[PDB]
Amino acid sequence: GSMAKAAAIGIDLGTTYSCVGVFQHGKVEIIANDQGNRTTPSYVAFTDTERLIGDAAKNQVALNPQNTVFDAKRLIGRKFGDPVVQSDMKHWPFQVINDGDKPKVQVSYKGETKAFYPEEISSMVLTKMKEIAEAYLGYPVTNAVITVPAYFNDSQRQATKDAGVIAGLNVLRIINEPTAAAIAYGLDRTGKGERNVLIFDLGGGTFDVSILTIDDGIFEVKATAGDTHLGGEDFDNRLVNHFVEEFKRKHKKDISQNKRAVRRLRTACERAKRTLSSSTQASLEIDSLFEGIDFYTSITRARFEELCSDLFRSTLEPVEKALRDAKLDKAQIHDLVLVGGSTRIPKVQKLLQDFFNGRDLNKSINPDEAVAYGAAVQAAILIKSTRAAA
Ligand SMILES: Nc1ncnc2c1nc(Br)n2[C@@H]1O[C@H](CO)[C@@H](O)[C@H]1O
Ligand SMILES: [Mg+2]
């Protein structure tokens, strides 16, 4: 009579990393890609012979900086003249050009100079997320829910839909990232009455705080606040500056002018930073870092916490601003939800918990996966077509 329907997917299309999930058998499965990664870099690289997307693109970025595109989400639905775009362009090694006051990324690809709209680069990331899901399900996927930041305007939301259509996806709905994180915890399924939820999202490059009110499963965004210049990369920069100084003291050598040595140092720092989230100390072991000198050292969690102390404390300023804008007191918040890999930092958790007088934080769903988790829950609800009984 009626053939079984393919599962719909939930995609968190992130600035730095993207994540895909599917709700099946009453639960969400976050789908690992072919390299065993549960998140995929939102990177696209172009060469004379190939277009590489995800881990393959991010792994060759060092020697191909001009033709490896990342951060397309910072350009999507914006005008070339927009002050945000103009400032961001100084930090990017790839070219951003002006086509009718719309930004386009220009690269060398398959023997030619090619320019792409931000939605086209995002469609390439969505194509990879769709293939990751089809590799797991074993059949073609058509339907998806895609998430966006709560502050995205109409043009930014329509360009995200356009990226989905280019990728061959039927976009069921564009939903806000803080709403998707709330849905992941079933915070819209608690019945009658108003609930105030604070979502604390600390990413690779930006920090966002959102206050939502939920009444009978209906979501209302009450306040948004954040810091565009606060993220995981700033903590990596503090460790980099620390070890450059340490090398200078120990071997009387300044490494800061050899890009490879700085890159190898930064790569090792980011991994030590992750180790320090579950360990009280971490080893740093780099062979022939500079002038054939082996750099074998360590860092305690206490020293790392001291190095980033001002940055961690500054996450509380947008929390207080969001609470003032929502016209609420901290005691009136019912649920605290953590989003982003940088929220695994014990000191970040301790500061926020202390601010809310020892309250529990919802962190049981991996914070780098919560948004895709909620998007997958919503995607399964949106494709239901039940006919009422008599
Ligand atoms: N366990 C973790 N402890 C500390 N930081 C982490 C962890 N896992 C992830 Br993922 N990160 C950081 O989150 C950001 C995501 O773009 C990057 O800066 C990652 O370094
Ligand atoms: Mg995110």
Swiss-Prot record:
Coiled coil: none annotated. Component of the CatSper complex. Identified in a IGF2BP1-dependent mRNP granule complex containing untranslated mRNAs. Interacts with CHCHD3, DNAJC7, IRAK1BP1, PPP5C and TSC2. Interacts with TERT; the interaction occurs in the absence of the RNA component, TERC, and dissociates once the TERT complex has formed. Interacts with TRIM5 (via B30.2/SPRY domain). Interacts with METTL21A. Interacts with DNAAF2. Interacts with PRKN. Interacts with FOXP3. Interacts with NOD2; the interaction enhances NOD2 stability. Interacts with DNAJC9 (via J domain). The modification N-acetylalanine is found at residue 4. Induction: By heat shock. It comes from Homo sapiens (Human). Residues 4-382 are annotated as: Nucleotide-binding domain (NBD). This is Heat shock 70 kDa protein 1A. Changing residue 79 to Q: No loss of acetylation and ATPase activity. Exhibits normal protein refolding activity during the early phase but exhibits defects in ubiquitin-mediated protein degradation during the later phase.
